[PDB]
């Protein structure tokens, strides 16, 4: 707690300096939001298959969006960007990463070791080694302390909603990680407990319920539409009992804001 406020302040500074270009997919000649959505969904599977943390997946996505913010990428190389990003994120966050051979194997050998490594080096150059990016998880972790009491279903559900925001560059690129986390948390807390974004967290973040509204409205819509959504790996992941079945919970029909 001495340093907890300072961590939060600093993560707020840093999340602004690792923000992707919000408009980047429009300037990107051979790729789209839906190609991105596929890749990320696959990264979720890859993370499930190798038992990676959730933070690892959130970092990789941040890396990928920063790289595409300043590099043109053809379609057939997008997955190589994604793979190297996952590999990098593993080396940063995992206790020990899977081996490169695995990351080659998970591509159906559509690339080679040489290519994955050469891309690792490229992502590192393009991100200037700035790998320690704030994620919505880091912010949820911090918010979870303001529960009275802790409620493991609220936690699991916030993380689920958070993880959904990864998939859809429209609209989730326009929101900072701290704001997505703010919404995800309020929405989970309402769905599970019927409470709202608490006064303590307003004081901590400066974010009012008003401020989170655009993100909430979008997040709610995503939650409502999640089972029709084209990529499902996350809804799958979070029907498990690890996450208290929260992907099966029925969203409210209104938020009454």
């Amino acid at each position: 707690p001495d340093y907890h406020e300072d961590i939060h302040t600093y993560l707020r500074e840093m999340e602004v300096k690792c923000k992707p270009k919000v408009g980047y997919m429009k300037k990107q000649p051979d790729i789209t939001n839906s190609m991105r959505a596929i890749l990320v969904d696959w990264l979720v599977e890859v993370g499930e298959e190798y038992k990676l943390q959730n933070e690892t997946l959130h970092l990789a996505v941040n890396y990928i969006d920063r790289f595409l913010s300043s590099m043109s990428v053809l379609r057939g190389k997008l997955q190589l960007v994604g793979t190297a990003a996952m590999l990098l994120a593993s080396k940063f966050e995992e206790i020990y990463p899977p081996e490169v051979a695995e990351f080659v194997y998970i591509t159906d050998d559509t690339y080679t070791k040489k290519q994955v490594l050469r891309m690792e080096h490229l992502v590192l150059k393009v991100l200037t080694f700035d790998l320690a990016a704030p994620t919505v998880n880091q912010f949820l972790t911090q918010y979870f302390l303001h529960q009275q009491p802790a409620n493991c279903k609220v936690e699991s559900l916030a993380m689920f909603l958070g993880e959904l925001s990864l998939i859809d560059a429209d609209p989730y690129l326009k929101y900072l990680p701290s704001v997505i986390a703010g919404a995800a948390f309020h929405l989970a807390l309402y769905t599970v407990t019927g409470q709202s974004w608490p006064e303590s967290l307003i004081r901590k973040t400066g974010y009012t319920l008003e401020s989170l509204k655009p993100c909430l409205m979008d997040l709610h819509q995503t939650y409502l539409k999640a089972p029709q959504h084209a990529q499902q790996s996350i809804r799958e992941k979070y029907k498990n009992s690890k996450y208290h079945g929260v992907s099966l919970l029925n969203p409210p029909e209104t938020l009454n804001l």
């Binding site: 001495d2 340093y3 300072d6 961590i7 600093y10 993560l11 840093m14 943390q53 933070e55 590999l87 990098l88 080396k91 940063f92 966050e93 206790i95 020990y96 990463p97 081996e99 490169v100 070791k113 994955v116 490594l117 690792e120 080096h121 590192l124 150059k125 080694f129 700035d130 790998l131 320690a132 704030p134 994620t135 998880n137 880091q138 972790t141 911090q142």
Partner: protein, 298 residues
């Protein structure tokens, strides 16, 4: 790399080798870490990935400045500010006379300032021991070697193979806690503080269990009153001998009451109750702190 002149080898170090070098254009004296690639296979080592990405966010006078990273196809180089030597070599050289108390105080004060800054920037060092603490002739001391450092925006899990040497290892870890916390860094600083003071390692264990029992003989075997949870921890055995807390006047004779107080709080058993770097700096023991200059032999 063409602008750098090898001066001399200064360590084999967290793989591969570390050279003193001179920039031929600016005259800046520098330390170089050479990583081969090779690697062996497997790309940029995880350890260098963390070291670079964390240490480049950590600009502070008590933290060894990372100056540059030169990334070839076939070789990777970290360039650091240069400092003449480590605390281990200096304690060693100071065996006969001892390190004067006011310089002990300066150093510990400085280490806590570096470490507070790490902690406020969500970095755990995890490998604080005297050879990873670097000093100069002007009387500064800096934290170095961030090979094992970790960001803790989300909790950091414990791992049998990536852990400080035994002597500076916190009791949490020896007892099998699942998460690291900032307190492990304070523990290590506590051990080092006492070592500067007494000239003797505080807990020099031959093994995990020996390390634990040495800790236990000095501070007493912890029980549930002192440290809620301790019995339920994975590597807690109820067969543990129940020793009693030695008199602190006898474990660090040279220290006054302020010094004993601070050390007691740095060696608190329960990680939540162990003093923080930030609170440590406000301890009365630093009331009168100064910045002496050591006598370095080199």
């Amino acid at each position: 790399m063409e602008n750098f002149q090898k001066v001399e080898k200064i360590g084999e170090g967290t793989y591969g080798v570390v050279y003193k070098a001179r920039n031929k254009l600016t005259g800046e004296v520098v330390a170089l870490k050479k990583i081969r690639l090779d690697t062996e296979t497997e790309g940029v080592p995880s350890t260098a990935i963390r070291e670079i990405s964390l240490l480049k966010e950590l600009n502070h006078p008590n933290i060894v400045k990372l100056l540059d990273v030169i990334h070839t196809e076939n070789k990777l180089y970290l360039v650091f500010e240069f400092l003449h030597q480590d605390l281990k070599k200096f304690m060693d050289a100071s065996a006969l006379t001892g390190i004067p108390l006011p310089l002990i105080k300066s150093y510990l004060f400085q280490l806590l300032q570096g470490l507070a800054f790490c902690h406020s920037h969500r970095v755990l060092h995890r490998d604080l021991k005297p050879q990873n603490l670097l000093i100069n002739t002007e009387g500064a001391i800096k934290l170095a070697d961030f090979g094992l450092a970790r960001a803790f925006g989300v909790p950091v899990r414990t791992y049998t193979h990536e852990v400080v040497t035994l002597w500076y290892r916190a009791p949490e870890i020896l007892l099998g806690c699942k998460y690291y916390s900032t307190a492990v860094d304070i523990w290590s600083l506590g051990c080092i503080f006492a070592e500067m003071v007494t000239r003797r390692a505080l807990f020099p264990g031959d093994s995990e269990i020996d390390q634990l029992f040495r800790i236990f003989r000095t501070l007493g075997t912890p029980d549930e009153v002192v440290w809620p949870g301790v019995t339920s921890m994975p590597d807690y055995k109820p067969s543990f001998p129940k020793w009693a807390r030695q008199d602190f006047s006898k474990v660090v004779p040279p220290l006054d009451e302020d010094g004993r107080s601070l050390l007691s709080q740095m060696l608190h058993y329960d990680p939540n109750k162990r003093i923080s770097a930030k609170a440590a700096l406000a301890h009365p023991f630093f009331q009168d702190v100064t910045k002496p200059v050591p006598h370095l032999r080199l």
